[PDB]
Amino acid sequence: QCVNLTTRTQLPPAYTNSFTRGVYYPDKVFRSSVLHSTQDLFLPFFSNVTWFHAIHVKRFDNPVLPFNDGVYFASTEKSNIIRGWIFGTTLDSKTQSLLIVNNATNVVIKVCEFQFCNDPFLGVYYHKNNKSWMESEFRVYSSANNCTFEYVSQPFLMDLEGKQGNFKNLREFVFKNIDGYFKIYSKHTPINLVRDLPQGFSALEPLVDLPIGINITRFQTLLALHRSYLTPGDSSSGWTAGAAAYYVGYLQPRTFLLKYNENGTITDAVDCALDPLSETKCT
Amino acid sequence: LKSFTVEKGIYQTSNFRVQPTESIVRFPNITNLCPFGEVFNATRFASVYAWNRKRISNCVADYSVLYNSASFSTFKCYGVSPTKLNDLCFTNVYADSFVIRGDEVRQIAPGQTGKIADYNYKLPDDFTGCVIAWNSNNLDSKVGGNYNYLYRLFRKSNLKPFERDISTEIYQAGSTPCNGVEGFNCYFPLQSYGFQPTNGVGYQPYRVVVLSFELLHAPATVCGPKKSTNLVKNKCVNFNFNGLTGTGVLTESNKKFLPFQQFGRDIADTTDAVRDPQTLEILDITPCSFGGVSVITPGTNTSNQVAVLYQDVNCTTWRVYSTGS
Amino acid sequence: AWNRKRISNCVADYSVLYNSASFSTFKCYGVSPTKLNDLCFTNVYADS
Amino acid sequence: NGLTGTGVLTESNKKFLPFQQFGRDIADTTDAVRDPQTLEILDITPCSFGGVSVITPGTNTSNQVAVLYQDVNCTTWRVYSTGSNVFQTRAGCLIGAEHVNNSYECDIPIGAGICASYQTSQSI
Amino acid sequence: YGDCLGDIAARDLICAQKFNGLTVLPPLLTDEMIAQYTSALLAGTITS
Amino acid sequence: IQDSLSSTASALGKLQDVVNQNAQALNTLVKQLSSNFGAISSVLNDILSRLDKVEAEVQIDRLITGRLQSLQTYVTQQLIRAAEIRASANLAATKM
Amino acid sequence: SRLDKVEAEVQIDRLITGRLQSLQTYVTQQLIRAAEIRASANLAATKM
Amino acid sequence: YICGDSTECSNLLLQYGSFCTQLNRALTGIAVEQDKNTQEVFAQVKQI
Amino acid sequence: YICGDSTECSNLLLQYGSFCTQLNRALTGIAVEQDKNTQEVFAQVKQI
Ligand SMILES: C=CC1=C(C)/C(=C/c2[nH]c(Cc3[nH]c(/C=C4\NC(=O)C(C)=C4C=C)c(C)c3CCC(=O)O)c(CCC(=O)O)c2C)NC1=O
Ligand SMILES: *[C@@H]1O[C@H](CO)[C@@H](O[C@@H]2O[C@H](CO)[C@@H](O)[C@H](O)[C@H]2NC(C)=O)[C@H](O)[C@H]1NC(C)=O
Ligand SMILES: CCCCC/C=C\C/C=C/CCCCCCCC(=O)O
Ligand SMILES: *[C@@H]1O[C@H](CO)[C@@H](O)[C@H](O)[C@H]1NC(C)=O
Ligand SMILES: *[C@@H]1O[C@H](CO)[C@@H](O)[C@H](O)[C@H]1NC(C)=O
Ligand SMILES: *[C@@H]1O[C@H](CO)[C@@H](O)[C@H](O)[C@H]1NC(C)=O
Ligand SMILES: *[C@@H]1O[C@H](CO)[C@@H](O)[C@H](O)[C@H]1NC(C)=O
Ligand SMILES: *[C@@H]1O[C@H](CO)[C@@H](O)[C@H](O)[C@H]1NC(C)=O
Ligand SMILES: *[C@@H]1O[C@H](CO)[C@@H](O)[C@H](O)[C@H]1NC(C)=O
């Protein structure tokens, strides 16, 4: 069912900086006006993160990336393009794989023995006669057996109409797989920048803890393209990309000094043993 | 002073320590009894290489109905005392059920070795919860053999805690590749148990259920069979909030907790604020012991009259032993 | 009159004892069972 | 042979007796070891050594700092970052502060008759 | 570090002290400065 | 001297140092109540509400030992500071 | 290298407590010696 | 300070009353010494 | 000094940072006091 895309033009990879970004709540305990020291897996301050983007100019990036003790994944978008993740070891129907997809109607999370093909994606079609954008193509996998987990959310409709201008929505996620538990922290922010990650601070709140029990070493991102009457290609040349970006970083065990204000929200943090001044601040 | 005689002067005694009045219990109000018959009284259990995991919620954990039948040969609990199971509330209880051989029941424990503990099922080193195991020779075993239960024998490396491996690929023991065929130095990983009613004690099927949970850190749904009590305030009382027991005064609060927070802690890492499970409101907990006390006395060979000085308090009743004059 | 045997020049794998010979009692003092694959032993005596 | 650790292995000069395998220090810690594969002695040395000090003005003034590494020449080496403005004193190697020839009532005591201050662009 | 690693076949006190995190800081005033101060005191008490 | 004392406020640091030292010592004594000291928790309530009084005494014993060590350290520091302050007071009395 | 991290924490806790006790004793001795040396230095300054 | 507002720990702690009493005696001596220091420094003259 | 060049023991020891910081503060005070003592004793005169 799924096909192969033969239109992308490749460029050397791009890297950016993580400006004091990627701090999440370590526990579910309320603290107010406290300087609290913690020892956990965090994204180091001023890290050299990787940048991927989907534009038409064409660039359409969704490679297989490693999974080293956890992943910090940020996404800047305006048309809800980035809409899925796939985690697994081999992705070749020999080991179990985890799939999280938002297909504009439901949020499906499945731990299942999938047969993923080379280029998984989703596809939206635009109708000229009346103004209605609808999702029509779902080409992630081909078969699924021994299918353990199951979760389907309530139905809904998502604004997937093509919008241009300036990037609006920034969504940050932290995934970590420990002791059979897949823990996901999430956060959403409205922004008005055009190119890169805004400089600022934002704490990530716990979102979900899935008891999956999977050996996870690799992961991949599921984007959505657009099909229009402008390009008369059949399946591999008639695809036009949207405009979105996502940044990837890896977590490491570190010591952090967090500041809880009077209301009980994290406002500042010190990545300890970053530079000797930070160590002095720790002491 | 460890003596019957006291010299003239002033001495410092213990602070004004006040005793509690009554005791209260506040548990979330749940009426359902979660299934003890779909976990312990089921008709079909999964194999050990693919063990069954079930989440349980909205409980009244009584376990007093398990006395009429289902005598358990093994019941070992880590992280909590067995006698305190009726005074606690549990956050998220997971039941892991499977069937093994009796001689292997000793391998279901933290920090153990063997084929079960290495290739099939592994428990974490920091384990909270506990293990139950009982003999089921008259249910899982039949004459002529019962090969419906399988287990893994060959694996490249040991498993991680709470990890499941159900893949069935040919295992290479020597150096030549196998390429999906069974031959010389190319074995099949899974093999079936052999269960018969005439086997020995060791070679008999044992059903094992492992319960995993967390205590006193997050909002709890599974709770014990204790009753509830009315809420009192502005008095030093003994409280039991979701298993957290203490003494203090409960006062109306102004903090607003996030929807996933239940307890608040001080800089000294002690409980300060708590959310009432019955009605969602925040209350602050304050100790009811406060204020120093000093005694002024002449020599005991002169008189027995003394004076008492209570620090940090006006007198213009109050927190005094006896007002007097 | 129990039997004592000295063992030497080993590769202590004990992974071949999984095909058969299920042990009802296996209790180890002075060393953790999980560290038996990361150690070398000086002089092993088996008393049977 | 089951003894796990971290360190630097160096050629040795000690000669063990035919029935000895490990050597120990006065603090009762492993110092020398014989290689089981080929019979030779190697000394084990920790790879952590040398003190570090940080000279800084108030954080409400500037974020620039200087780092003094004890017991090391600078005349790369065992430093976090070489950078520039390397200065050599008898208390250690100073990185992040330029050297002058004047002499005032000194502000921040570094040591061995050397002090530091925040002056004028703006620097240490 | 290249000197304490040099004398690994010979026992030393300062190397063992420093390898365990016990360091000695240098005094702020050197002996030359103290000698200058003493000479100034002598000159003041002799001439004036 | 009146004008100099009125303008500056950094000449009387020898007393602010003592006040700050005492306050900081008390605050540190308060801080040291969050240490596990090898036990499973830093609160008596959790240990009492999770374990019966046959295996909960070990953690309580460890906590008691740690708290006593902290108190003794504080007392020794106070004794040394009292000695030096007494020497300073004797010098002041001689000067008066 | 001999025990896993479920029964090896006890010995490490004991060792940590002992080392901390040694460090505190050393610090107290140094404080007392510093006090007496400071008294001697004050006497020397008065004499000068 | 140790386990205030608790009953079982008080029963356990009853075997450290000598230590607690000794600490309190030291603190009382410190306070009395400070009062004596102030009185000795500032009350040299007797007639106002 | 306690368990240098080890990772697990550092994680265990993270619950004694207050003690370590207090010891270091005492030692720093001692060193500053000694420097002040030398400066006060030998720098009575200002003009060389
Ligand atoms: C991918 C599946 C997915 C994930 C991992 C996630 C978090 C998430 N995002 C949202 C609002 C909400 N959530 C989303 C979608 C997203 N944030 C994303 O990371 C992605 C991929 C989308 C879908 C494209 C949108 C487009 C909006 C419309 C307003 C807003 O920007 O929050 C919710 C609360 C919805 C309710 O309670 O009624 C949650 C749990 N949400 C999802 O749908
Ligand atoms: C989880 O998956 C990884 C990758 O498949 C496993 O690592 C491999 O282990 C085999 C053992 O023979 C090696 O041949 C491979 O070279 C390893 N690959 C990598 C990237 O490390 C790993 O063993 C699995 N973890 C568990 C607990 O089973
Ligand atoms: C007879 C030669 C053995 C000599 C080796 C001596 C020490 C090294 C140890 C092996 C551990 C005990 C062997 C059996 C382990 C049982 C594993 C199981 O199935 O649960
Ligand atoms: C896409 O490419 C992969 C390998 O390059 C191949 O296995 C697959 O058959 C291809 N699919 C299509 C539709 O060409
Ligand atoms: C840091 O980002 C740059 C991009 O300019 C890249 O060249 C470099 O490889 C990155 N460094 C590391 C260690 O990845
Ligand atoms: C009009 O919009 C609907 C959905 O909104 C779409 O199915 C349809 O294609 C459009 N009408 C025609 C004639 O295509
Ligand atoms: C997985 O599915 C295959 C065939 O669909 C079957 O042979 C096997 O028994 C299943 N394994 C598990 C654990 O369900
Ligand atoms: C805390 O929340 C309140 C809203 O009730 C807000 O007015 C106040 O500014 C917040 N305090 C801080 C320091 O932000
Ligand atoms: C039972 O629980 C609900 C909370 O949803 C609460 O509103 C109600 O008052 C409770 N009933 C009693 C008798 O407290």
Ligand SMILES: *[C@@H]1O[C@H](CO)[C@@H](O)[C@H](O)[C@H]1NC(C)=O
């Ligand atoms: C278990 O099942 C049997 C019959 O199915 C029944 O007699 C028994 O009462 C049940 N026990 C429990 C605790 O439900």
Ligand SMILES: *[C@@H]1O[C@H](CO)[C@@H](O)[C@H](O)[C@H]1NC(C)=O
């Ligand atoms: C095997 O052991 C002997 C020691 O007798 C040694 O000489 C030889 O080098 C070793 N073989 C290898 C590959 O190291």
Ligand SMILES: *[C@@H]1O[C@H](CO)[C@@H](O)[C@H](O)[C@H]1NC(C)=O
């Ligand atoms: C650096 O080593 C040289 C000898 O080559 C020596 O002159 C110098 O004393 C050393 N540095 C210091 C600060 O002593």
